[PDB]
Amino acid sequence: VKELLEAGVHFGHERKRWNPKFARYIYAERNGIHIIDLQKTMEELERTFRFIEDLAMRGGTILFVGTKKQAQDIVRMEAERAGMPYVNQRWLGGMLTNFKTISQRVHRLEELEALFASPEIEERPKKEQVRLKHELERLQKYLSGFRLLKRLPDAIFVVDPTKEAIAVREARKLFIPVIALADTDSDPDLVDYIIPGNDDAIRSIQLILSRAVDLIIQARGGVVEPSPSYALVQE
RNA sequence: GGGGAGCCCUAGCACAGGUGCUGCAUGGCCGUCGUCAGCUCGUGCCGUGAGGUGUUGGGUUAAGUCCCGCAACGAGCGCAACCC
């Protein structure tokens, strides 16, 4: 499944902007791109997906992060299929040191959902209502998937290794094992259980996250059908 | 017949009183900076630390009012706003 479908439509990318460690898990650099050695790909696939199966049988919280449009679409629906919080929006620097900040916004969000369905409609002048609508769409858009993150999330899949090494940075400081994906440019060793690949290829990520959902379901149950991407994959 | 209390007269004994100097000795109180929009703190990062960040970019507003990136998310005097 993996190696076959993988090579068939995806592997490496970027243009000699690479990272050292990358090169060791990689064959070639040829033409202008670094070519994913699918072997050890599948090796750490074994490590990581072992983890996945295990604590999917137990139950935990990991991210679907793609602050970039690409991944974004896919992961969002993946969340609305897997169950955990996701960060498609700009992951903000604060959560993993300022849990209380977010939790303030969050309890307040409970109260916001509350006062939405309330006789406070006609009351409190029109423009004011407009303002409250605006804060609504704020916390709504950003805290799209992530809204049900109660407790601490124990590992954090996520894509592109740079910005999402800012994400890595927070998780990493608060002693949290990183699962995550990377292309050519940035480093994987700040991650314990990495994933090399093409964070510019759409089919790659889709296959990965979709069958990873079906990995939690390989430990959970209910195996249905893959909808995300496909149509949105090449248009 | 006297003394005394309110009370009046002179002299004295305690002292009031003065728009005389000091707004670089003050209060309050204004003049200005200029409706100019700045000035800020709660949780946490960055540097050994002082300290920074917040608030520095792009449109845009009567405004740091706001939108997009954002070690940042909240709040203060403002700014707004209920009175006329």
Breaks, C-N > 2.5 A, in chain A lie after none
CA distance A128 to A142: 22
Token pair listed for A9: 């439509």
All structural domains of chain A, each given as residue ranges with its CATH number in brackets, are 4-91+148-235 (3.40.50.10490), 92-147 (1.10.287.610)
CA distance A180 to A118: 42
Strand partners, A180: A194
**CB A168 within 8 Å of CB A63:** no
Tokens 């605006």 locate to: A134
CA distance A218 to A81: 14
CA distance A171 to A178: 7
Give the closest nucleotide to A100 (alpha carbon vs C1').
B43
Cα distances from A121 to residues A124, A132, A138, in angstroms, run: 7, 11, 20
Helix/strand/coil (H, E, C) string of A143-159?
CCCCCCCCCCCCCCCCC
Q: Is the CB of A100 under 7 A from strand B?
A: yes
Q: Is the CB of A67 under 7 A from strand B?
A: yes
Strand partners, A35: A27
A218: part of which helix (H) or strand (E)? helix A202-219
β-pairing, A35-36 vs A26-27, is antiparallel
Token pair listed for A214: 């079906």
Strand locations in chain A, DSSP E?
Answer: 26-27, 35-36, 64-65, 86-87, 179-182, 193-196
- Percentages helix, strand, coil for chain A (3-state, rounded to 5) are 50, 5, 45
Q: Is the CB of A59 under 7 A from strand B?
A: no
β-pairing, A193-196 vs A179-182, is parallel
Q: Is the CB of A132 under 7 A from strand B?
A: no
